[PDB]
Amino acid sequence: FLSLDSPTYVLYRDRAEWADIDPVPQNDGPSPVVQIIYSEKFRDVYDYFRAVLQRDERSERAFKLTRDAIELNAANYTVWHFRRVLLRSLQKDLQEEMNYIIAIIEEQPKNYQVWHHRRVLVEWLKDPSQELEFIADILNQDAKNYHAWQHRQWVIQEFRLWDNELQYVDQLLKEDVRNNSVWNQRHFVISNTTGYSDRAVLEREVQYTLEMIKLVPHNESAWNYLKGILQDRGLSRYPNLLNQLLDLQPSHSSPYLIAFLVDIYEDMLENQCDNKEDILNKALELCEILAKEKDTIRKEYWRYIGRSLQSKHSR
Amino acid sequence: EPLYSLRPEHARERLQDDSVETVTSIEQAKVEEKIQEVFSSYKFNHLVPRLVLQREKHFHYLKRGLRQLTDAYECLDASRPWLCYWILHSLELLDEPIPQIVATDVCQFLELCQSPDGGFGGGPGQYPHLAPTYAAVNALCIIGTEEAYNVINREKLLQYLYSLKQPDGSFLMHVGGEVDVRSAYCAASVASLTNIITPDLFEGTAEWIARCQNWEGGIGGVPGMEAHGGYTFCGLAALVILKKERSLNLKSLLQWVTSRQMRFEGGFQGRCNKLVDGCYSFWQAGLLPLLHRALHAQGDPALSMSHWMFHQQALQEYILMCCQCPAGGLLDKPGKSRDFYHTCYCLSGLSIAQHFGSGAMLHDVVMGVPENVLQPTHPVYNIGPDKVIQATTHFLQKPVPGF
């Protein structure tokens, strides 16, 4: 009821309702390290919180108190734990608790505790009806929020809510085709629904990914998706690919194009193919175009690659 | 001649947005903007560069913070051991010795942090949790004394760890808490340094960690999730402690870290198509040493014995030119504020980019002035290699509580 930023706000030590209970100051010891010089507001709330925690007071007023402790420091997992113990004791309305954690997440989306707590609710309520849409709204503010994706996966898994996700994925990729969190999501949907071991699907996928690489050749996320779906199986399984990437080289070049060619040559040479010493030179060559001109931030990696190729495709 | 970010060729490394613009590109374009400003500073001004690590400024910042903090740190009130660790570790890197005065007060404080059920919490009488238990134990080892070692109640540390261990080989971050690879690595860091690894403890763990490696090559927080630096570091590191690196596909892991150095900025991003950030100087770059050791326990004959598989010089150039606060302390990127987390990890990162060790071969690279060299850091634990030696050797003397 009495908000922390209300101008009527009163310290807990000035509140009638708390007259009967002595604050427990933090014991930092005789001469302390990393001491935080807490504001009055903050130290007041936490002194009283230690008191309720010690006495294990399972009461409505303690419950409202945890609210305030959380608002002052949403990272205090001890406080969240006590709030959960209080949600069970005082047998509180969880629907209402959901509206609370909706509000807080919306305020502090990059916090572990806040999402963990939501998760425990959904688990107790056994009910995901609000989640996709919720997540969708945070994700509408930060399309890359790690916990929001983590929460989303967890929900989709638990409640088998796969049916509409790929279409979520397409809406986001449309709005930002560079969103690597969305490409990870695509991989997660497909890999758990149809799977990548279905030829129509592997095709539709690969055709999509090239179509993206066309529109925006320098987006690495498409490139990593393409490599990620094929390489399980072995790039040399797909002989058109080497050729087709060779096509768009003039009109669409990039260090990703060259590096993919090298991954291809790598797979060929390990599969005992046409020209063991031949392919080796195409590879080793581009290893220098990358190490020395086209991708020098990685020079040290490319020289390891050239040098590994040699060290195992020589004889 | 002499500084790679300033070379003319380098203007070329700037974003090609293939004329298609999204939030991602706009935003990356923006940092490249501010970073170019910082690089171009040295020209436009009219005097030559020479790069200094503001040591004394960092030191006064650290020395003070170890003792007392403004209320800007209310939100790190559940992370106090972290503050100890971050600050002590920055001190030991800058090579500043810890007075017995401070060492012993840290000692006593971490002790107040210790739960009667094992582990440590974020502050006195908070419940125990793995991140602070990991911070406490590292801070205690940075300290290295008998007093510091003796603070840890190993019996309970093992009870605590077991109480968090899940059927699928994973761990809770804390009772009623939740799971994520961090917990694996913390458990591993703390169990190993204090010699409490029993045979069953990490069973299933390496396989759980392995499941977190994804289609990108790196590791995500839990299976299915995007590859990310912090989590990848924890994964690999937990796997090296466990001596099960082999479980991962180390080749795509490598291809993944390496792709995370930004070509223009020279620093690292936590994940693909996101933004450079100085703390990744350790979480990402510190993979390369871990990967080097692991390919090496497999005869990989093609490894360098001068360098890690990243542009050491560019990382250094980024940390020095872009992540240094004139006032003292270090930062994510220009325009952000100081903090002890970034002071810690930018420096841990600079040390890694300076020092190559690998059996016989030692080789350094110290950009700008040579007073810039930091003390080396152990890449599994991110305390100094000696403090690791010292504490294992000591804990190796009592038996695994069991025995």
Ligand SMILES: COc1ccc(S(=O)(=O)N2Cc3cc(-c4ccc(C=O)o4)ccc3N(Cc3cncn3C)C[C@H]2Cc2ccc(O)cc2)cc1
């Ligand atoms: C915006 O303020 C914060 C403060 C702390 C965090 S954190 O505990 O989740 N953690 C460490 C971290 C610490 C700082 C920081 C602030 C002040 C100090 C001491 O001087 O250190 C700042 C950020 C921060 N983050 C967020 C971040 C880091 N780099 C870019 N960002 C946006 C990282 C985070 C790492 C972490 C630590 C422990 C853990 O169990 C999980 C993650 C996150 C955001």
Ligand SMILES: CC(C)=CCC/C(C)=C/CC/C(C)=C/COP(=O)(O)OP(=O)(O)O
């Ligand atoms: C031992 C231990 C606890 C280590 C900490 C591991 C660590 C650094 C984890 C990062 C986790 C996370 C949710 C990042 C997202 O930040 P973001 O999305 O704001 O940042 P980004 O854009 O760089 O990913």
Ligand SMILES: [Zn+2]
């Ligand atoms: Zn950072």
